[PDB]
Point group: C2
Chain length 51, copies 2
């Protein structure tokens, strides 16, 4: 793949660092997702309150 | 919003159903994040293997 073609040009140490960064990056994305879902919830709550 | 104007129409029962559905929806999106980040590990590992 293109990603492999790019990554093969990096040092081993850089590749090790990139591998280790994935889990914390994913965890931050999950936190972002939770914040986006508060904004999905709110209009529904607002509509309930307007009935 | 046109979305809010839609939601205001809905019965309380319909709003409750939508609010409750957001939980499995968010969890499904967390599962997709897991898949996306595992995609990402593979080419890194492949580039490491190739040294």
């Amino acid at each position: 793949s293109m990603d492999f073609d790019f990554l093969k040009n990096l040092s081993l140490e850089e590749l090790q660092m990139r591998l280790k960064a994935l889990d914390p990056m994913m965890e931050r994305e999950i936190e972002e997702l939770r914040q986006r879902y508060t904004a999905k919830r709110q209009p529904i709550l607002d509509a309930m309150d307007a009935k």
